[PDB]
Amino acid sequence: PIFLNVLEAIEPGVVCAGHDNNQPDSFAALLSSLNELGERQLVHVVKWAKALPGFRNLHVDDQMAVIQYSWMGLMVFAMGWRSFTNVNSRMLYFAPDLVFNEYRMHKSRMYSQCVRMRHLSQEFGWLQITPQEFLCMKALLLFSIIPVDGLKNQKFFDELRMNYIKELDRIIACKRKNPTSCSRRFYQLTKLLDSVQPIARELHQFTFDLLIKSHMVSVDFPEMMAEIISVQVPKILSGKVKPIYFHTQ
Numbered sequence: 001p002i003f004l005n006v007l008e009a010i011e012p013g014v015v016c017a018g019h020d021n022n023q024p025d026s027f028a029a030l031l032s033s034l035n036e037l038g039e040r041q042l043v044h045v046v047k048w049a050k051a052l053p054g055f056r057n058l059h060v061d062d063q064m065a066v067i068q069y070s071w072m073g074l075m076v077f078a079m080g081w082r083s084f085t086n087v088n089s090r091m092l093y094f095a096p097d098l099v100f101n102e103y104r105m106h107k108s109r110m111y112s113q114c115v116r117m118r119h120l121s122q123e124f125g126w127l128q129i130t131p132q133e134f135l136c137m138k139a140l141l142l143f144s145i146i147p148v149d150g151l152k153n154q155k156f157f158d159e160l161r162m163n164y165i166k167e168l169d170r171i172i173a174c175k176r177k178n179p180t181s182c183s184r185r186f187y188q189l190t191k192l193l194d195s196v197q198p199i200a201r202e203l204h205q206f207t208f209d210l211l212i213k214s215h216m217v218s219v220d221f222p223e224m225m226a227e228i229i230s231v232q233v234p235k236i237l238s239g240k241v242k243p244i245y246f247h248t249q
């Protein structure tokens with residue numbers, strides 16, 4: 001049980017946004033609160049990642065980058081799970097103090113993207129994704145997007161990803177006395193992982209675009225946000241850093 005012992009043991013607790021629920025819903029407040037939530041969620045992903053099995057084989061700057069490139073898809077992924085498990089995918093459960101209803105979806109101007117993220121949530125229920133399946137997939141997300149140019153030491157990354165792909169394959173919810181079953185379960189879960197990437201890309205696009213006009217619209221971006229968004233995110237949007245897909249796109 002050792003691998004999943006780890007994952008569950010290091011799975012972060014509740015991160016609040018700091019949001020002031022008892023004021024008017026508005027774009028500037030909704031998005032200033034998400035940027036503080038993203039900033040906090042980051043700090044936790046950092047410690048979560050660093051405690052992952054085998055993670056510190058990676059070169060130190062690879063570690064940071066990997067985290068930076070994966071940070072949005074992971075947040076989104078875990079977010080969707082919170083929304084699955086807390087509200088049964090009706091609303092987006094960013095935080096206990098930041099739960100997006102339809103109305104906030106519109107006011108945040110992220111309706112198109114919230115829709116996708118919510119669809120994602122619903123897949124968890126449709127597919128009856130087990131909590132165990134969720135953690136393994138989420139851990140695997142960390143290792144699903146790299147510079148095409150390669151990492152400072154790619155050898156150890158491939159070894160981890162391979163090993164993390166292996167661990168998910170053991171734990172899939174399936175009839176082991178039936179070929180088609182586990183075969184089928186894997187395919188589904190791989191597709192689901194793949195489906196996280198286009199959504200992350202949309203959020204990147206939006207946050208980046210948003211950052212550029214942040215001075216105008218007075219949406220506050222934290223230290224590490226602006227650092228990531230202006231430096232790492234554009235590499236992804238420029239096609240320098242690409243997601244590792246299971247299936248061809």
Ligand SMILES: Cc1c(N2CC[C@](C)(O)[C@@H]2C)ccc(C#N)c1F
Pocket residue numbers: 031034035037038039041075076079094095203204206207
């Ligand atoms: C997508 C996202 C967050 N933000 C932060 C950056 C963004 C593009 O504005 C994006 C919508 C922030 C926090 C959680 C959490 N938990 C999250 F899932």
